[PDB]
Design an enzyme around this catalytic site. Sequence first.
Site: not given
Lengths: 157, 157
Positions: A56, A66, A68
């Site tokens: 991402d 990543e 989150k």
Amino acid sequence: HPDLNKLLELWPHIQEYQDLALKHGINDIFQDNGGKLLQVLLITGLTVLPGREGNDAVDNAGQEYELKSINIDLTKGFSTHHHMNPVIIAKFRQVPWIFAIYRGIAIEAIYRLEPKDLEFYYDKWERKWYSDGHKDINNPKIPVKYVMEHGTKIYAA
Amino acid sequence: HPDLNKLLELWPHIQEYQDLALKHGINDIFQDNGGKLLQVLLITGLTVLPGREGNDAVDNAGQEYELKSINIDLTKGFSTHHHMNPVIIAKFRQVPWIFAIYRGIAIEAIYRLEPKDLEFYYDKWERKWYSDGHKDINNPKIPVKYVMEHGTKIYAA
């Protein structure tokens, strides 16, 4: 019209924030938590990657991450991946993860887990696929507690 | 030792340039044309993507780009992809391409072709795969002339 007044006057900033958000690839701060995501991007210096990308985000040196996040006011586990399988896992363990912890919309803290810091869950998740016979895992979660225990806090409110 | 002298004294800058290059994900300016690539990155504001990625760069708003370049002192065609096939094509036509034109190591110009501006070659390349029976295409080229004719020049020396 009391509250309403705060609207034609508070709207100059909201719009500016959205202008800022657009310069950062976020088309709508009011959808898919774009307003929270900008927070993280500005604090960390990251650039978002197109939704079609496995990861991402990426920094100015080409390292990907990543991303989150959760609002602890309503949940304590971090989402990972729907239809989670071992190939997804395999791509995941190659990059660091950065976790954003919010209280409502307020960013409270951000943690960074290195690839190895997630080794425990990747292994666990594999068992629940193969011992499970074979079959995806629908979004297992990563406990905020664990994240705080093993990550390095790169930001705090 | 004439020329040699220019070495212990010119080396402060070369090193600085390399420092700049590292902040931009380029570990060695002296390999794989890293020193030229930094030029393009600093002019355009782009960030490089990990080599494993299909595309090679992305801007601050999450838009990705293919990054091709040549030294016209020795060639006139832009390389595209080894073992080029229609899936590669398919990923390619989704993003804009930016072309760097150098004279030796000097950046002379940079052109940007939108996805549609390459439609002609993508179609041609498909024929040479299927009419060809089936079989990859080993790196067909894109003529600098064509690039100049259809791109918009975003930089000139």
